Amino acid sequence: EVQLQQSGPVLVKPGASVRMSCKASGYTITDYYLNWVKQSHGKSLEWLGVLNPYSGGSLYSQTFKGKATLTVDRSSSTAYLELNSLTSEDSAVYYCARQLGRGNGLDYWGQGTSVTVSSVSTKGPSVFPLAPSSKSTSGGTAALGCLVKDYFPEPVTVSWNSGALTSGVHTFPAVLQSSGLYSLSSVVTVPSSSLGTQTYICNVNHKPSNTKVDKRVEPK
Amino acid sequence: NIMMTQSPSSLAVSAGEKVTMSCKSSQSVLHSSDQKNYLAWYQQKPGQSPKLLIYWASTRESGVPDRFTGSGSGTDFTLTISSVQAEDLAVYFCHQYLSSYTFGGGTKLEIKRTVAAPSVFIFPPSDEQLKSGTASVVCLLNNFYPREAKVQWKVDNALQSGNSQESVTEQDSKDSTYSLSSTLTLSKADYEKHKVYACEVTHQGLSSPVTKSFNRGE
C-alpha cells in the first residue's frame, strides 16, 4: 500500500535551519509530484511549494521562496524540505503530500513532521505509572495509565503493549505547566478480572530528548 | 492570492442528519484548458493527516463514501454529507489549486449524542515519583457527554485552588464521548500532611457531584 513516511519531530533554535524527509513506499516516487504544506494549528493549512521528483525541479509559493528548499534522492525514494532562518512563527507540522498531476487533489498525505522553534532546551519526561486500584474500578473495569511529566517540546507519543492494546485508550492533550514544560497522561480501561494474567506496558517516546521508556503498570 | 472562506466555522449534528458547509473563493477557480473548477475538499480527523474527498469541485475520490458530495461553481462551493456518521467528526477543508495553492480555514463537524455521565477514577502518586519530591494525583473522567464538566480537588475536605491542570480529549469517533484528566500537583512534604485526597465531579448526567477519593498510604 502507498506510504509517505516523514521524519520525526525536532526542536531547533531561532535562526537555525532544519531539514526533514518524506520517504515514499508502495509506489514509484517519480510518478507523482510532491507538495509540502504547513499546519500551524488545527484550523490552518498553508502551501509551501511542489517538487517534481522525476526532474528534481521545484515551484515555490512566493511566501516561501528562498525560505524553503525542496530536494529529492530518487535512489532511496526520499524527498526533503529544508527551511532556513527559522523563527517562532515557523513552528508547525509540515506535511508532504503527493499529487498526480496539475488537475488533481493532494491524494495522499504523510503523517507530518512537527518542528518547534524555540530558545528553550529539550527536556525529557519522567514516566510514572497510574496504577489500577480499588478507586480506579467501575463495574468490573479497571483504569490504568502512565503520567508523562515535565518535557519539552511537544510531541510525546504513547502506545500500549507496543501497539497491541488500542481499544479503550485515551491519550490526553498535553498541558503546559508554569515552568514551560509539558505533561500528559495516557490511560486505558481493562477488565478487572484479568489484571493478574495480562501485562500492561506504556511505551513512551519523546524523540527530541532521545527518551524511549517502557513502563510496566501493575496494581498498587 | 485567491482567498478561501469557509462557513460555518463549526457545527454539531446528531448521527443521521444532513449537513452542508460552504466554501467561497475570492475569485474564480475555473481552469480554462479543461473547464474544471480546481477545488478540492479534505477531511482531517483528529490526530490524523488530511484525506482527499473531492476534486474538480464535484468528483469524489476513489474510496470516498457516497454520502460526501461536492457541488458549486463560480466562487461558491458546498460540501454536503447526506447522513452523518459518528466517524465523520473532522475538520473539513477546501482548497483551490488554480493559482498558488490556498486553503479555507476549516469547518469543524462535531457530533451530538445522548447524555452520558463520566466514569470517575482517581490515582495516587506513584512511589517512584514520591521518592523524587513531588506528588501528582490524577483524576480521570471517562467517556462522558456533553463536554462540559467540572472537577474540584479536595484535600481533607479543603477545596484546592491554583495547583491543578486539566485537559479534555477530542471527541471519540465511535461513541461520540469526551474524556478529561486533571492533575493536582503538591510537594511531597505537603502531600504527606493530609489523609483524604478527593476529586469531586459535576456533569450534566449526574444529579449531585460524584466524589472519588483515597486515603493516603492505604
Binding site: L59, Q62 | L98, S99, S100
Partner: peptide, 11 residues
C-alpha cells in the same frame, strides 16, 4: 502569473 507558472511546471 502564478497560474501560468503552475501550468508550465506540470507540463
Amino acid at each position: 502569473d502564478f497560474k501560468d507558472e503552475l501550468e508550465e511546471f506540470f507540463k
